[model samples]
Target: GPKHVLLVSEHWDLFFQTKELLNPEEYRCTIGQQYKQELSADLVVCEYSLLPREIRSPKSLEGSFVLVLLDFFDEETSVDLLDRGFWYLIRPITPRILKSAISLFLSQH
Candidate 1:
């Protein structure tokens, strides 16, 4: 019963924080390599922050259910510039995306 989603990589902090806000123990986390070898989850949740480095090769991730959380809190120098110009703030949008993805997954199957 692969009903769970696999959370991958340095996204552990993001995942755990979100888990605390939601169901803290129902999901699972693992490295990309280990996930590739062992996971058969209904969905695969990954941090877009790490995508440039981890999922560089399409061949490495074929036939896998993948979802990337776009980290609005990305640590880029230009980000601060935008925040300063706007309201000197920013918030993570991943939670809403996560909820939508989960709801969509549940509805489809």
Candidate 2:
């Protein structure tokens, strides 16, 4: 079965661009304005701006792997987010790079 991927972002371009990279053969992608209980998925790809607000509890996302897209890299924020079990990629990323990262992460699941 294809893995379920929930893409959370306010920007439509980002969602479209990202969804295209995930490839339907391996991933079933869904779009969400924010993260919520009903929107459960195997993996979550969201924007950095959407969080500490869109996500309320780490426990709510226990079994899910979250990949956050950041406009810029910040060590403090990245460390904190990683500690909460969220992975991130700094922006100005190529489509291939993003795909490679997601592919590597998904392989572990």
Candidate 3:
């Protein structure tokens, strides 16, 4: 364990809920610079669309960490709920695909 886990979320409420679930002994919850800083950790779980370009450069971090990007896509809805068939189709496959990508990345280092 890194002693801390940086959970970056656009939704503060969701962040709080996740924080309660994970309950790191020492955690930092914010959409702030502290999350992007070069630090020591076992994992850095990000909830954003784009990976921070700076983290990809050489010798950026001193420890092993995994960046989990959760890509959630839903049908556009204005006044009505999307049909169940269309909505349910993508749910099951998303995590499997993402986990595969993460496994591939983990093997490289």
Candidate 4:
């Protein structure tokens, strides 16, 4: 939970704006190969549909991460995100709410 962010997919719009609210340059946000772009980072938040699939390492990713759900599932996405081992979360608003959600999410991590 010490880090966050990536810019791609539906994740593109939200991650971009949320970082600004966190006082800018929250962390190095990236989109593409870590080796090719040389973009090693502390955080890599994403929705369920990241491209190439392999880029998602949520279950074992030692780095901090979050999940974005443009829609819903059951009793809050947390039924999944939190249990899936995410560091934090946000719900529908579904963008503006992130400011505080990310804040709360990081607090416990």
Using TM-score, give the best candidate's number: 2
Which segments of candidate 4 are over 4 A away from where they belong? 1-4, 25-40, 51-61, 68-70, 75-83, 87-91
Model 4: colliding residue pairs: none
lDDT tens per residue, model 4, 34-107: 21212354444444444232333366566545444334445554455555554333346345576566555555
In terms of lDDT, which candidate is strongest?
2
> How many pairs collide in each candidate, listed in order?
0, 0, 0, 0
What is the TM-score (0 to 1) of candidate 4? 0.49
Worst 10 residues of 1 by lDDT: 81-90
Give the TM-score comparing model 1 with the true structure, all chains together.
0.45
Q: Rank candidates by lDDT, best first.
A: 2, 1, 4, 3
Per-residue lDDT of candidate 3, residues 29-73 (tens digit): 334323453365434545434344334423454654535343454
Runs in model 2 lying further than 4 Å from the true structure? 37-40, 53-62
Whole-structure CA lDDT of model 2: 0.72
- Is 1 or 3 the stronger prediction by TM-score? 1
Model 2 steric clash pairs: none
lDDT of 1 by residue, 1-109 (tens): 2256666546555566555444535444444523342446656655544444323324344544555555365566334333332111133545555555554654564
C-alpha lDDT score of every prediction, in listed order: 0.47, 0.72, 0.40, 0.47
| Regions more than 4 Å wrong, model 3 | 24-35, 38-41, 53-61, 72-109
Superior candidate under lDDT, 1 versus 3: 1
Supply candidate 4's per-residue lDDT for 90.
30
